[PDB]
Design an enzyme around this catalytic site. Structure first.
Site, PDB file in Angstrom:
ATOM      1  N   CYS A   1      -3.870   3.422  -5.341  1.00 55.93           N
ATOM      2  CA  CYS A   1      -3.384   4.182  -4.194  1.00 55.93           C
ATOM      3  C   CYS A   1      -2.126   4.964  -4.536  1.00 55.93           C
ATOM      4  O   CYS A   1      -1.990   6.124  -4.145  1.00 55.93           O
ATOM      5  CB  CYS A   1      -3.134   3.259  -3.004  1.00 55.93           C
ATOM      6  SG  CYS A   1      -2.106   1.858  -3.370  1.00 55.93           S
TER       7      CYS A   1
ATOM      8  N   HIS B   1       0.822  -1.194   0.000  1.00 53.61           N
ATOM      9  CA  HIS B   1       0.000   0.000   0.000  1.00 53.61           C
ATOM     10  C   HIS B   1       0.863   1.254   0.000  1.00 53.61           C
ATOM     11  O   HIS B   1       1.950   1.292   0.593  1.00 53.61           O
ATOM     12  CB  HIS B   1      -0.938  -0.015   1.211  1.00 53.61           C
ATOM     13  CG  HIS B   1      -2.106   0.902   1.071  1.00 53.61           C
ATOM     14  ND1 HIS B   1      -3.096   0.708   0.128  1.00 53.61           N
ATOM     15  CD2 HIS B   1      -2.435   2.035   1.741  1.00 53.61           C
ATOM     16  CE1 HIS B   1      -3.991   1.678   0.229  1.00 53.61           C
ATOM     17  NE2 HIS B   1      -3.612   2.498   1.199  1.00 53.61           N
TER      18      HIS B   1
ATOM     19  N   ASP C   1      -4.702   9.168   2.806  1.00 57.24           N
ATOM     20  CA  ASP C   1      -4.813   7.822   2.252  1.00 57.24           C
ATOM     21  C   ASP C   1      -6.121   7.671   1.484  1.00 57.24           C
ATOM     22  O   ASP C   1      -7.184   8.067   1.965  1.00 57.24           O
ATOM     23  CB  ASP C   1      -4.730   6.736   3.327  1.00 57.24           C
ATOM     24  CG  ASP C   1      -4.750   5.341   2.732  1.00 57.24           C
ATOM     25  OD1 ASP C   1      -3.667   4.794   2.423  1.00 57.24           O
ATOM     26  OD2 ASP C   1      -5.857   4.793   2.547  1.00 57.24           O
TER      27      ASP C   1
END
Lengths: 190, 77
Positions: free
Chosen positions: A148, A81, A98
């Site tokens: 992401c 991530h 995020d």
């Protein structure tokens, strides 16, 4: 700033996962473009500061006065991530962005400790106190499980050029393509 | 005109090298790879957090005796 191998660029392709060469190279582009205002730590900074403490990242600011900058961008890598910590120096606020709602305030304290330490060595009394955590704010979230890195880079561009988050999930394909061309040119193609 | 250089990995390993301050660091990077079994598209050599290009010298990176080069791994996410 410099040019990437074609297989690093390929991590922008389709819905592939961005790797560290894309993240770090775009960071270089971003602070190539506003260097008196933004400092971008690479994606290895955090692991190094965590597993080897201030003495393991001491020398990485050898050429930088962090505290003359306006914005520090620090990409955070969590297993699978990409996420983002920002430090706005004018008001001593450390924020955590995020694109999948993940809360990791556990690591913005490492950052706070880092900043207070750096302030001590760079003889900066005005920065030996005052750091805040950011009150969390609605920022554009992803609707797939692969963007992401792309979200993190777009937050960086927007923050760096002082633009608003004027984007959403449906823009990501175009942004993957824009980031790709910006990387081939080694310049931000606004 | 030789210099000593340490190459530190994510596994805590450390390896020493002698190199002339003006040879390009590509021979150390390729030596370190072959010796550790590493694939050089999967690792990244960094000195003080800055990337090291194949053509870069210890001299133009301003390294000194016993300085440390860090090796990091590909990250995806």
């Amino acid at each position: 700033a410099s040019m990437l191998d074609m297989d690093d660029l390929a991590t922008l392709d389709g819905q592939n996962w961005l790797n560290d060469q894309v993240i770090n190279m775009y960071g270089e582009l971003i602070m190539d473009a506003v260097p008196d205002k933004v400092h971008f730590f690479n994606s290895f900074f955090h692991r190094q500061l965590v597993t080897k403490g201030y003495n393991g990242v001491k020398r990485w600011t050898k050429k930088v006065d962090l505290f003359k900058k306006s914005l520090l961008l620090i990409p955070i890598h969590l297993e699978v991530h990409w996420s983002l910590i920002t430090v706005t120096l004018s008001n001593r606020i450390i924020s955590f962005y995020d694109s999948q709602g993940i809360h990791f305030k556990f690591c913005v304290e490492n950052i706070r400790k880092y900043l207070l330490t750096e302030a001590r060595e760079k003889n900066r009394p005005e920065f030996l106190q005052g750091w805040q955590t950011a009150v969390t704010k609605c920022i554009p979230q992803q609707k797939n499980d692969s963007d992401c890195g792309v979200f993190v880079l777009q937050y960086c561009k927007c923050l760096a050029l002082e633009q608003p988050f004027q984007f959403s999930q449906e823009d990501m394909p175009r942004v993957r393509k824009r980031i790709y061309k910006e990387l081939c040119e080694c310049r931000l193609m606004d | 005109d030789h210099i000593n250089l340490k190459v530190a990995g994510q596994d805590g390993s450390v390896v020493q090298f002698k190199i002339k301050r003006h040879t390009p660091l590509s021979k150390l990077m390729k030596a370190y790879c072959e010796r550790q079994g590493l694939s050089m598209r999967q690792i990244r050599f960094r000195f003080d957090g800055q990337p090291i290009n194949e053509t870069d010298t210890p001299a133009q990176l301003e390294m000194e005796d016993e300085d440390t080069i860090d090796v990091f791994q590909q990250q995806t996410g």
